[PDB]
């Protein structure tokens, strides 16, 4: 009776060391890591109860139950039982009343202050991708307090310990303005990850190369422009970058009038990711808005459009032409007849070699302004690209069925 045995035996896996959740391990799993707050985690469960009845099972469907730690799924002892298992680990699991449901009970047959018991196997887990694009992974050691987070424009206090390709190089507290971090000894990935962090939250962050110390690097620590990094963060306290419920658009528009100029100075200074962070913070600040007057909404959409027109240029200079076109796609959502927004989209698509789509917006630049010489030149470049590509293909493929008929011997 494994479910009866775990009532008084196993490793204490509780955060409180309270004996409320115990595991009897029958097969120790692979890896020394066990799941962290914000991980997606997959576990086989079969379950029984202090009234002698069945709980619920993922083993019976031949597919694991899926968990998100710190938010949980259904039982606090299952959240603890998940957070403390290695990959392919087999164990029996206890759940005392305070870790079950307390007084509340549960369906189908769980009474008030029940004890619950399980036979279990952990299958797999994945970290929190902060964007769903491999840019930053974050895994959390402790959940913090708050509904609003220090996005760009915030002043924050953090513990920050930093690693270059795994090599630790800095271990200290830093205070900074978010969305400026090379000027504060901080990577772009901390300026972005802090948009999702709470008070006294503790986490590990893996930062992709576009999330390093931008074009500046940190030569003091031996660190290159756009380096790939790993970090430990505690967010200790913050002056929050006010959300759309917390502050008006006018305050974010006066900050956008300063920040668009700073972005332009960073762009003309060759610091294209610092410019992306200026235009891109205006894009965060104004696209979150609601409940505006028509004049406030026109100002909000105008400073979005101007930020998307300069994000387009920065991402063109970065050769991130997909991000240039994702900005022009929204400049043309704010005004479908904006001349620079039609043009820049044509450039991003033509530099991406999709000339049929590029002429498809330069020809609209010539509806808005027939005198735009650049749209005329870039339409000719779309046709030069089309003709050269099809002639190249003809130079490659021509007579291949004769070549194959000749080669077959």
């Amino acid at each position: 009776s494994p479910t009866a045995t775990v009532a008084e035996q196993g490793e204490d896996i509780t955060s409180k060391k309270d004996r409320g959740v115990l595991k009897i391990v029958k097969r120790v799993g692979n890896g020394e890591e066990t799941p962290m707050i914000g991980d997606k985690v997959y576990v086989h469960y079969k379950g029984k109860l202090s009234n002698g009845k069945k709980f619920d099972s993922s083993h019976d469907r031949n597919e694991p139950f899926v968990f998100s730690l710190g938010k949980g799924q259904v039982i606090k002892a299952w959240d603890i039982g998940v957070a403390t298992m290695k990959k392919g680990e087999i164990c029996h699991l206890l759940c005392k009343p305070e870790y079950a449901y307390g007084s509340a009970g549960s369906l189908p047959k769980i009474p008030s202050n029940a004890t619950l018991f399980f036979e279990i196997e952990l299958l797999d887990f994945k970290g929190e991708d902060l964007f769903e694009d491999g840019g930053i992974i974050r895994r959390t050691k402790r959940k913090g307090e708050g509904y609003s987070n220090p996005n760009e424009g915030a002043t924050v206090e953090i513990h920050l310990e930093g690693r270059c390709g795994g090599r630790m190089f800095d271990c200290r507290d830093v205070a900074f303005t978010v969305g400026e971090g090379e000027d504060h000894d901080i990577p772009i990935g901390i300026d972005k990850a802090l948009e999702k962090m709470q008070r006294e939250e503790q986490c590990i962050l893996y930062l992709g190369p576009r999330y390093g110390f931008g074009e500046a690097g940190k030569p003091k620590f031996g660190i290159e422009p756009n380096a790939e990094l790993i970090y430990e963060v505690t967010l200790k306290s913050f002056e929050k970058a006010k959300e759309s419920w917390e502050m008006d658009t006018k305050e974010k528009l006066e900050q956008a009038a300063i920040v668009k100029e700073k972005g332009t100075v960073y762009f003309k200074g060759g610091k294209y990711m610092q410019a992306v962070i200026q235009y891109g913070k205006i894009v965060s600040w104004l696209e979150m808005e609601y409940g505006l007057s028509e004049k406030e909404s026109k100002a909000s959409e105008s400073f979005l459009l101007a930020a998307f027109l300069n994000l387009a240029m920065c991402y063109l200079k970065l050769r991130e032409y997909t991000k240039a076109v994702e900005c022009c796609d929204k400049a043309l959502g704010l005004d479908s007849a904006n001349e620079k927004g039609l043009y820049r989209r044509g450039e991003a698509q033509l530099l991406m070699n999709e000339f049929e789509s590029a002429k498809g917006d330069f020809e609209k630049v010539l509806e808005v302004n027939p005198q735009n010489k650049a749209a005329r030149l870039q339409i000719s470049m779309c046709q030069k690209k089309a003709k050269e590509h099809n002639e190249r293909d003809r130079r490659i493929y021509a007579n291949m069925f004769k070549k194959f008929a000749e080669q077959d011997a």
Binding site: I396, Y397, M400, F401, F404, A405
Partner: protein, 628 residues
């Protein structure tokens, strides 16, 4: 000659009623609740012309009292009770029933209709009881206790105990192995299942708090049989509170049919379309159907596949009847020809429900998004209603803006030169809407119906015609387009100028196709695989090759013959003509023609007999594309 009355061997006759009539012991509680519902109806009736009959008590109600420590279940009522004569008659005599004898005395204008008639139901108490005591008090006699272990005799005594005023108290001294009928969970289940529509409050006296000394659950029937009321008076809110009470659902109903049948059968029904399809609606082979049959508000049966056809199994509903024939167990209906006459009416009135739901388009979309499988399965299984069911179909079409239209909307838009409703089938709306077969239909401005579930391919086998227009697949041989004589002449000329190539390609592709032909159906694709008319389409074959329990032996002859069609104006095909007229046996023609066949199998929605031998052609084109 000598003449004799029949006798009965009471010792064996009682043993039959206990051991052999009733297959589930739990029904004893429905029998003692039905006896109390009869006893309440008798006094409720007799009081209508004499209010003083209720002087002895006015609350008409039932109470259940499971006393665990005395191993006893009590069932009590404030019904009419029994005189000493009525005890020694109606409980002393097997197959005697005071309920029947009462109803035979009434005029036709009486509002009453009682459950009992067999004179057996009380004895079912001995399914669970070692011994039964019936305490009783009529108005016109003293309080008495009747008691027996069913052992061939019973005793009647004047009762000196607790005065009841007027009513009955059946005390069941349960068997040691039948103590589960003392558990309030079990009692709730049995009462809620068998009897929740009894017209009088059934109160269950549970347990001490943790303090309330003995908490009573006020009404196990905390509901009403609303179907007994006039359908013109009931509002949609009342139907909704009932639908939730009936089903334990939290959501409302989508549509409801409420009606009566008047004739040799008399019955009433509520039929509800639920807001959502159950997640298991076709998977749950155990819960086959969702109609419950009641007689006089007492439950008879539910999971009867005879009550409605399988395609309507989504309908949650109640049937209730005054005079149907019940089996001795009352666990089932007797005359199975009645289920046919119920089924004909339930189905007829469901297709009226959907026909009136189809006037309320905004709700009809909420219906069809979930029960289109049921309507289409109806077109498959039900040949009588197939006409009506076809007008319930909605489909996407080439002339519909990502919206679903009926075959009658298609008939409203058809060009007068058509005599057919053109349809296509495949795995997704984008796969069929981009597909090679519609190219000419789109050029002529002809509407194409898209049918894109695996169930659509079963539906169209039966749905051969609508409104005298032939439902014709665009994926089958010899598509009749409404051409003009100029185009018909061009097709005869194009069949003439390509017939050499058609022979050359048929020689290269032999047994992989039945034939190769010039196409009146393509514009911009060079070629496509269609099939012969008498067999499974490209879509049907892929569906049948995925039915896990289907016999392979039919697939070997129902799989239709692949015909390659050739576009006469595609530049690949005119070049392939110039190649084929130069050399019939050219290795470049041989490998190109089999590549066009494999590309046409994929574009037409077949699988390849071997994908790897096709991939090895594209990987050779890619070796050139890279410059290897």
């Amino acid at each position: 000659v000598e003449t004799f009355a029949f006798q009965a061997e009471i010792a064996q006759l009682m043993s039959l009623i206990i051991n052999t009539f009733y297959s589930n012991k739990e029904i004893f509680l429905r029998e003692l609740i039905s006896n109390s519902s009869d006893a309440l109806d008798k006094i409720r009736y007799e009081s209508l012309t004499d209010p003083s009959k209720l002087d002895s008590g006015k609350e008409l109600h039932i109470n259940l009292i499971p006393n665990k420590q005395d191993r006893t279940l009590t069932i009590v009522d404030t019904g009419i009770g029994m005189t000493k004569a009525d005890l020694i008659n109606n409980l002393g005599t097997i197959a005697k029933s005071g309920t029947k004898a009462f109803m035979e005395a009434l005029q036709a204008g009486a509002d009453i209709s009682m459950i009992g008639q067999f004179g057996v139901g009380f004895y079912s108490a001995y399914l669970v009881a070692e011994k039964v005591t019936v305490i009783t008090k009529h108005n016109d006699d003293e309080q008495y206790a009747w008691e027996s272990s069913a052992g061939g005799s019973f005793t009647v005594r004047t009762d000196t105990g607790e005065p009841m005023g007027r009513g009955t108290k059946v005390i069941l001294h349960l068997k040691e192995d039948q103590t589960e009928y003392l558990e309030e969970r079990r009692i709730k289940e049995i009462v809620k299942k068998h009897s929740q529509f009894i017209g009088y409050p059934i109160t269950l006296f549970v347990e001490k708090e943790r303090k309330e000394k003995y908490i009573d659950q006020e009404e196990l029937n905390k509901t009403k049989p609303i179907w007994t009321r006039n359908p013109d008076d009931i509002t949609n809110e009342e139907y909704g509170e009932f639908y939730k009470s009936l089903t334990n659902d939290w959501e409302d109903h989508l549509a409801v049919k409420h009606f009566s049948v008047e004739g040799q059968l008399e019955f009433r029904a509520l039929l509800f379309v639920p807001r959502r399809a159950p997640f298991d609606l076709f998977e749950n082979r155990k819960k086959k159907n969702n109609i419950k049959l009641y007689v006089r508000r007492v439950f008879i049966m539910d999971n009867c596949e005879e009550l409605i056809p399988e395609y309507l199994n989504f309908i949650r509903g109640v049937v209730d009847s005054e005079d149907l024939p019940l089996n001795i167990s009352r666990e089932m209906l007797q005359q199975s020809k009645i289920l046919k006459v119920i089924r004909k009416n339930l189905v007829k009135k469901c297709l009226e429900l959907f026909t009136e739901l189809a006037e309320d388009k905004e709700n009809y979309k909420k219906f069809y998004e979930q029960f289109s499988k049921n309507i289409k399965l109806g077109i498959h299984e039900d040949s009588q209603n197939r006409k009506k069911l076809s007008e319930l179909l909605r489909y996407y079409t080439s002339a519909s803006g990502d919206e679903m239209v009926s075959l009658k909307d298609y008939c409203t838009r058809m060009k007068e030169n058509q005599k057919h409703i053109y349809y296509i089938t495949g795995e997704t709306k984008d796969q069929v809407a981009n597909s090679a077969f519609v190219e000419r239909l789109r050029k002529h401005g002809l509407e194409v119906i898209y049918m894109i579930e695996p169930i659509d391919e079963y539906c169209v086998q039966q749905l051969k015609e609508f409104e005298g227009k032939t439902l014709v697949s665009v994926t089958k041989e010899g598509l009749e387009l409404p051409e003009d004589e100029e185009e018909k002449k061009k097709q005869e000329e194009k069949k003439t100028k390509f017939e050499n190539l058609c022979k050359i390609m048929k020689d290269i592709l032999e047994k992989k196709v039945e034939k190769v032909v010039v196409s009146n159906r393509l514009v911009t694709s060079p070629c496509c695989i269609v099939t012969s008319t008498y067999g499974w389409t490209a879509n049907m074959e892929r569906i049948m090759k995925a039915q896990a329990l289907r016999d392979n032996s039919t697939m070997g002859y129902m799989a239709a013959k692949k015909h390659l069609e050739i576009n006469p104006d595609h530049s690949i095909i005119e070049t392939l003509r110039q190649k084929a007229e130069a050399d019939k046996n050219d290795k470049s023609v041989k490998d190109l023609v089999i590549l066009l066949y494999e590309t046409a199998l994929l574009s037409s929605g077949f699988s390849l007999e071997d994908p790897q031998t096709h991939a090895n052609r594209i990987y050779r084109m890619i070796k050139l594309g890279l410059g290897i």
